[PDB]
């Protein structure tokens, strides 16, 4: 609302609430009043090939346009560039991982003039620069402990719920829970993935299950997605970066390295 | 669990670590493959369809196995069979004495257990067992095992329940054994002091066994650095108090037993606050013994196991009030303590399971004269024999109770059932008729209902 | 639409979305039942505090299912109770 800069930003690490804000975003603009006529959510992820027959194929939609098919995709482009110069649009860009210029795919580049807002998420702060967002960029910050405990609880079922919940009486299922939950260091998709594995621990196991999550993750179940689910950051680099990378996990846990 | 995830270890299917062997029993729990079933979670079975899918899938898969258990075998099946097969097992059986020398180069597992007639076996039996891992010959009647010097592979051995009376030499030139259990050997003779001649072994127990290290002088665990289980049997002072030095031997004792211990009229959870893996503690025919100090001191170990047997002289066992080091304690049985007139804080285990009691003619009651009942785990209670057992406690809720069963109780006058608790959990009553009678109830529905549904008597 | 929609014998996680089932939430009256055989199943579609065990027939149940798999010149030979045969 406030910002003279109408391109925004928003990056953070992998997994971590990014498409799940940028959701929320635009469920709750429906409920506040405001004068953009038209809000289109776009995600990009789905190619690094830039594909943009599905981008213009999913802004003809939103715009009530007539799709075609034989229609070179530069016409497109200006075609839908003049549409959406005469509208006030906030279009959500979602996980952009190389800069792709906008009105190439059709989307015109919002000035000071003009009233339209364009955000776009990413997991690297170089793209965002990229695309002329440098002042209004935000990090996405991990949940914070309560937060983090509270979505924990949620993956759980009722029978394993109803011994990790009670407070007043101590009990280690609820300390070895903690210590499974922190493990997670709040990241939303790490949380979720870990309690789903534990729904359905038994009183017994708490133990065992606390003492191997906080050196090995590997033999917990589904991890092998979520880390299949972040690899691409690793990917995206350069031998050399790849090999510097692995080299900071010498290093002793939960420290800081010079 | 213990036991699969054990043999899995040995096997090699786990990477050193039991929590993978809890992981791949809680997936196929998970897949409906296995399910849980016991008193506790620790416990599983499989559903007979699904056993005989698994033989099917052996039957059409290349690795063969020979898996005759409990089918009533009174003759153990001929060597032709075994030849061939790469995992036996023939546990449960009636075999009485075993002839033949296999030739099974493949044979990698391989059990003997809860066979009674099992004796005698031929010797050089083991020659062609090169590749095996994991071989039990527990709960069995044998003396001796045989030369075993051509196990270039063995990992896991244990004759839990056998009357075995001497190890043979040849077992410590196997570097490659990892587990030794020796447990509930009435029978062992031989010296612990050759033991050191091992170099990797991971668990040893010699827990409620014959012979175990009575002095210091067989104290030689110490040169196995690579134990990080050890089970002892105690018989003298000394091994405790030498025992209590810094080192992660003394750390390792996860389950204690004394037996026939003399110059030990007290003990202290103090003197064992350096062992934080303790949990299961055993005490039987240690006549010299007085009283037991439980102090308030919260060692990092947690209790759960406790047992005592045969302990005329002992008189009472005092229990820090406000918080005690058995606040974790499971189950709780005592036996034969004629000097007992101290039980009741046993009001304060909350985590109490299953008691079984017996001729201890000293106790008045297990509870004589936070906002909830003190047994609402409570399971299991069994009293026999106990002439002045007045009572048990004052009545108190117990909605897990399942199974109740005392005899000969003259004195038991009243017990702490009523009809004021809910009922769905109950499955089974046992006791004596004459004592059913003699009880004194506050209602008379708690008669009808118990003697009709739950009462099964002897 | 308050929809009521029977998922069978799922066996991987898959996004309701994506086939394009809308995922019911507490403001809307659509309730999804599915089944699986793995409780791993279950859980991944938020439905960890709604699970059922399908539990095997009883001794009974069985006896009487049984008896409906077998011919009448069969059946008539074990059905007869008083009498015990082998
Ligand atoms: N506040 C939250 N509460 C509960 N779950 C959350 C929350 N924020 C995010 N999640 C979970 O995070 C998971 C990953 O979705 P999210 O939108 O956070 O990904 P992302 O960080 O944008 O990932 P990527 O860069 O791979 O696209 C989802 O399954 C979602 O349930």
């Not at chain 2, 037991?292 to 820090?320: G, K, Y």
Request: charged fraction near 20%; proline fraction near 3%; hydrophobic fraction near 40%.
């Amino acid at each position: 609302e406030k910002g003279d800069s109408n391109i925004i930003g928003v990056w953070g690490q992998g997994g971590v609430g990014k498409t799940t804000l940028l959701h929320v975003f635009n469920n709750d603009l429906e409920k506040k009043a405001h004068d953009y006529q038209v809000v289109i959510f776009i995600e990009v992820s789905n190619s690094e090939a830039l594909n943009t027959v599905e981008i213009q194929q999913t802004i003809s939609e939103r715009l009530n346009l007539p799709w075609n098919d034989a229609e070179p995709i530069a016409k497109r482009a200006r075609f839908l560039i003049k549409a959406l110069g005469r509208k006030r649009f906030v279009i959500l860009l979602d996980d952009v991982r190389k800069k792709f210029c906008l009105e190439d795919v059709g989307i015109p580049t919002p000035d000071i003039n003009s009233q339209s807002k364009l955000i776009l998420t990413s997991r690297y702060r170089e793209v965002c620069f990229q695309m002329n967002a440098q002042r209004s960029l935000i990090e996405m910050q991990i949940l914070g402990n309560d937060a983090s405990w509270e979505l924990f609880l949620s993956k759980l079922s009722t029978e394993t719920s109803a011994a990790v919940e009670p407070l007043g009486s101590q009990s280690a299922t609820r300390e070895h829970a903690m210590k499974i939950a922190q493990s997670c260091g709040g990241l939303p998709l790490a949380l979720n993935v870990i309690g789903t594995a534990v729904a359905g621990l038994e009183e017994g196991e708490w133990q065992s299950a606390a003492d191997a999550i906080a050196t090995n993750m590997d033999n917990i179940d589904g991890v092998d997605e979520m880390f299949g689910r972040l690899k691409y950051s690793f990917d995206r680099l350069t031998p050399t970066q790849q090999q510097c990378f692995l080299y900071c996990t010498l290093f002793p846990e939960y420290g800081s390295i010079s | 669990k213990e036991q699969l995830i054990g043999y899995w270890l040995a096997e090699g299917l786990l990477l050193n670590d039991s929590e993978k062997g809890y992981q791949i029993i809680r997936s196929l729990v998970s897949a409906c493959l296995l399910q849980v079933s016991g008193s506790m979670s620790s416990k599983v079975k499989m559903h007979h369809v699904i056993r005989q899918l698994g033989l099917w899938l052996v039957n059409k898969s290349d690795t063969k196995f020979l898996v005759q258990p409990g089918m009533a075998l009174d003759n153990a099946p001929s060597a032709e069979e075994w030849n061939e097969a790469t995992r036996i097992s023939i546990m449960s059986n009636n075999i009485t004495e075993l002839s033949f020398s296999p030739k099974c180069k493949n044979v990698t597992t391989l059990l003997m257990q809860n066979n009674p007639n099992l004796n005698k076996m031929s010797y050089g039996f083991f020659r062609t067992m090169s590749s095996l891992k994991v071989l039990d010959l527990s709960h069995t009647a044998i003396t001796s095992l045989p030369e075993c010097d051509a196990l270039v592979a063995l990992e896991h051995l244990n004759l839990s329940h056998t009357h075995i009376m001497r190890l043979p030499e040849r077992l410590w030139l196997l570097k490659e054994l990892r587990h030794l259990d020796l447990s509930v050997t009435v029978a062992f003779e031989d010296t612990m002091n050759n033991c050191s001649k091992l170099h990797k072994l991971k668990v040893l127990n010699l827990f409620r066994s014959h012979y175990g290290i009575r002095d210091v002088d067989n104290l030689n665990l110490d040169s196995l650095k690579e134990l990080l289980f050890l089970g002892i049997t105690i018989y003298a002072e000394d091994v405790l108090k030498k025992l209590n030095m810094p080192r992660p031997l003394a750390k390792s004792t996860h389950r204690l037993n004394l037996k026939y211990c003399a110059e030990m009229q007290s003990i202290k959870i103090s003197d064992l606050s350096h062992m934080e893996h303790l949990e299961e503690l055993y005490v039987e025919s240690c006549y010299d013994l007085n009283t037991v100090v439980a102090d308030a001191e919260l060692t990092t170990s947690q209790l759960q196991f406790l047992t005592l047997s045969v302990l005329p002289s002992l008189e009472s066992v005092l229990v820090a009030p406000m918080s005690h080091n058995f606040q974790y304690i499971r189950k709780l049985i005592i036996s034969h303590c004629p000097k007992l007139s101290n039980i009741t804080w046993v009001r304060r285990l909350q985590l109490l399971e299953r008691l079984v009691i017996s001729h201890c003619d000293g106790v008045l009651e297990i509870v004589e004269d936070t906002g909830q009942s003190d047994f609402p785990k409570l399971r299991l209670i069994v009293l026999t024999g106990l002439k002045k057992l007045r009572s048990i406690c004052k009545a108190r809720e117990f909605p897990c109770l399942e199974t109740l069963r005392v005899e000969d109780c003259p004195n038991l006058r009243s017990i702490p059932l009523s009809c004021t608790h809910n009922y769905w959990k109950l499955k089974q009553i046992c006791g004596s008729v004459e004592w059913w009678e003699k009880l004194q109830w506050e209602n008379r529905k708690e008669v009808a209902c118990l003697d009709s549904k739950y009462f099964i008597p002897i």
